[PDB]
């Protein structure tokens, strides 16, 4: 690549899960590789993680997990975002743990297990307060009654019971101890109606890094696997011992001199104060560069951190080097490692008024990924 | 048909939009701009649709997007302008692609390339008339203009056109507009006198095309308007401008349940139910292209009524408050589509997320499948 590409370090990835493994000594690890691994490459990161000690693999959509098996990845895998008509049968045949939050899901899977002549491994999801997916406390008895019954009929096998936190990245939030308590009480009742789960889990990356009383048998870690801290309130990847996996770089396409008082970019939302040097970065919002980052986004050009000049276009944006010099083809680092003096996904989150989760995840397809580290077959 | 979420592209809306646009610049050619996967609509399918409908030129930003079009079997004139040292000059020249030169480093590369390729490269000179983005500054025109006419004589290149791009065309009656138009006539002319005979002179994008007839010249570069979306509300709705929206984003509810009064919804708990009600889970989040920034305002059409994103929008989904109404898993929700059909539109979302329509349709995820209608059967094979 010469215009813009993403450099993924697989050694950073492996070291992260080894760090996270130590953080929860008595628990099992679940590397979440959903959404193309938050933009780093689903399969490469799935193999690296697993190699480093990942016992489970989790994704959102059935398609995402199927594609994981398609690439010959063994071990326990699980998905949780189903919609009526999903590929229940296919998932069951590949021995993937599908999740259930309602009777409709349970009924769809039970019928699929029949056609497949096999038993689906299912995990019941408790809605302990997030109010997103999962079963409400008011319908827990009912759904729990059906599982054990569908279990007796040998059609399904309840392998686990799980929930998910709403403000776990906000240390001290009252909503946290609530859900955690509601989790225990819901688990008891189900464990009493004839359910012996293979795994018990509720924690995510922030919960994992903060509350041990929430580790149980398994922990589902996503973002931290990529060396990005869930929130500033928890620390920088550096303080967390996490190492950034992606480095986004580009080459300048033009460097010119313009008189003082010259407008730059759409809407001329930036006017040159004095005759200066204007560089051109060939990466716009279609490549994943937030347009709300207009005027703030940091770029590492010529030994100094520069700022987005004016509006950010679909394909490119300009930067004012001032007195400094540079030429077409030169390297620019839009986001990378804080330990290398470069900008980070957090820096851009703040610049764009969003979160580090969005920054990395929304990095386009038009942008090639280049792998380094891990083993050779990982780079596929 | 997709079970989670998907996008349907109406190829007839595309075919009709260009036929409308041409009738606006009667004495100028039309270059359809399908860069960025046709602003999220599917590059090859739309490129074919627009050609057959009347586009004489195709425009993409990068050489790769241009080499993909050729690789897909598309003929006719094509041009790309975003280049960096080491680009596929040779490959681009062999495939007969009009490229843009704004600096000398480019000229020397295409020259070395036209040499290896044993062919003459058709180049177009970009002039920076105010945008301050790309193109030659007025103070380096003669230098570039000179070296060019020199490359001509050597038989390496061939200057096929002189152009430029506006900064505030989409802002009706902006001072920058006239100022930029003026520089064009002066910079262009000089190039003529010094020898250059251009095949085409262009400067108009969608807004300028729709508003200023004196910006047409030989060619006109229209991107957004071709897909039925209007550059700016300050120009009207696709309806008034006489345009038909081409994209329709639909998803299927995954869950619908009842929750007690005072329950929190999503991360941070930014939304609390004022009473006992029905909540519905839409399985699509910011990884599919839904702006997280539209959290709490993004309009969706669910069960006969427009609902607002209840709380924080997530990576893979978000919830909507059905209130008293009822619905179920599998029922379809329309995120964005045709206002004429009483559906939320790209502008609606553009406003909700505090941005411009251009970015909404352009950033629709790749995890999101595309389904084509109308047009010619063979148009949706690649
Ligand atoms: C159920 C579940 N568990 C674990 C994770 C991993 O979380 P971290 O990345 O914070 O470690 C996620 C991802 N959460 C997102 C965020 O938005 N939509 C989701 O599915 C999740 O949804
Ligand atoms: C150089 C160039 N020509 C023509 C067009 C087509 O313009 P319309 O889409 O308005 O018809 C664009 C706009 N492309 C975008 C839009 O925003 N930033 C860009 O680079 C462009 O960049
Ligand atoms: Cl130069």
TrEMBL record, chain B:
Domain of life from the UniProt record: Bacteria
Signal peptide stretch: none
Residues with PTM N6-(pyridoxal phosphate)lysine: 35
Gene3D superfamilies: Alanine racemase, Lyase, Ornithine Decarboxylase, Chain A, domain 1
CDD domains the record matches: PLPDE_III_AR (cd00430)
UniProt GO molecular function: alanine racemase activity; pyridoxal phosphate binding
Residues forming the catalytic site: 35 (proton acceptor), 267 (proton acceptor)
Residues bearing PTM N6-(pyridoxal phosphate)lysine (covalent): 35
Binding site for pyridoxal 5'-phosphate: 39, 133, 206, 221, 223-224, 358
GO cellular component: cytosol
Pathway: Amino-acid biosynthesis; D-alanine biosynthesis; D-alanine from L-alanine: step 1/1
Binding-site positions, substrate: 133, 315
Function, as annotated: Catalyzes the interconversion of L-alanine and D-alanine. May also act on other amino acids.
HAMAP family: Ala_racemase
Family affiliation: Belongs to the alanine racemase family.
Name assigned to this protein: Alanine racemase
Species in which this protein is naturally found: Streptomyces lavendulae subsp. lavendulae
Gene: alr
């Amino acid at each position: 690549p010469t215009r813009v590409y993403a450099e993924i370090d697989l050694d950073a990835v492996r070291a992260n899960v080894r760090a996270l493994r130590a953080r929860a000594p008595r628990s099992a690890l679940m590397a979440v590789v959903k959404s193309n691994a938050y933009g780093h490459g689903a399969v490469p990161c799935a193999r690296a993680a697993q190699e480093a000690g990942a016992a489970w693999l989790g994704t959102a959509t059935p398609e995402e997990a199927l594609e994981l098996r398609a690439a010959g990845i063994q071990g326990r895998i699980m998905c949780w975002l189903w919609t009526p008509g999903g590929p229940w049968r296919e998932a069951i045949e590949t021995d993937i743990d599908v999740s259930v939050s309602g009777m409709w899901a349970l009924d769809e899977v039970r019928a699929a297990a029949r056609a497949a002549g096999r038993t689906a491994r299912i995990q019941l999801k408790a809605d302990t307060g997030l109010g997103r997916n999962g079963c409400q406390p008011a319908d827990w008895a009912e759904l729990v009654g059906a599982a054990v019954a569908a279990q007796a009929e040998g059609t399904v096998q309840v392998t686990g019971v799980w929930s998910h936190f709403a403000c776990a990245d906000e240390p001290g939030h009252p909503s946290i101890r609530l859900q955690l308590d509601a989790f225990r009480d819901m688990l008891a009742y189900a464990e009493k109606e004839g359910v012996d789960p293979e795994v018990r889990h509720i924690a995510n990356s922030p919960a994992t890094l903060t509350l041990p009383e929430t580790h149980f048998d398994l922990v589902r870690t996503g973002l931290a696997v990529y060396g990005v801290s869930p929130s500033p309130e928890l620390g920088t990847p550096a303080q967390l011992g996490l190492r950034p996996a992606m480095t986004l770089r580009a080459s300048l396409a033009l460097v010119k001199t313009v008189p003082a008082g010259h407008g730059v970019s759409y809407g001329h939302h930036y006017v040159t104060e004095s005759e200066t040097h204007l560089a051109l970065v060939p990466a716009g919002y279609a490549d994943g560069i937030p347009r709300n980052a207009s005027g703030r986004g940091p770029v590492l050009v010529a030994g100094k951190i520069r700022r987005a000049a004016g509006r950010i276009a679909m394909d490119q944006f300009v930067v004012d080097l001032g007195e400094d010099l540079a030429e077409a083809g030169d390297e620019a680092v839009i986001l990378g490692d804080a330990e290398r003096g470069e900008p980070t996904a957090e820096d851009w989150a703040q610049a764009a008024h969003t979160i580090a989760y969005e920054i990395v995840t929304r990095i386009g397809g038009r942008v090639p990924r280049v792998y380094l580290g891990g083993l050779e077959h990982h780079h596929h």
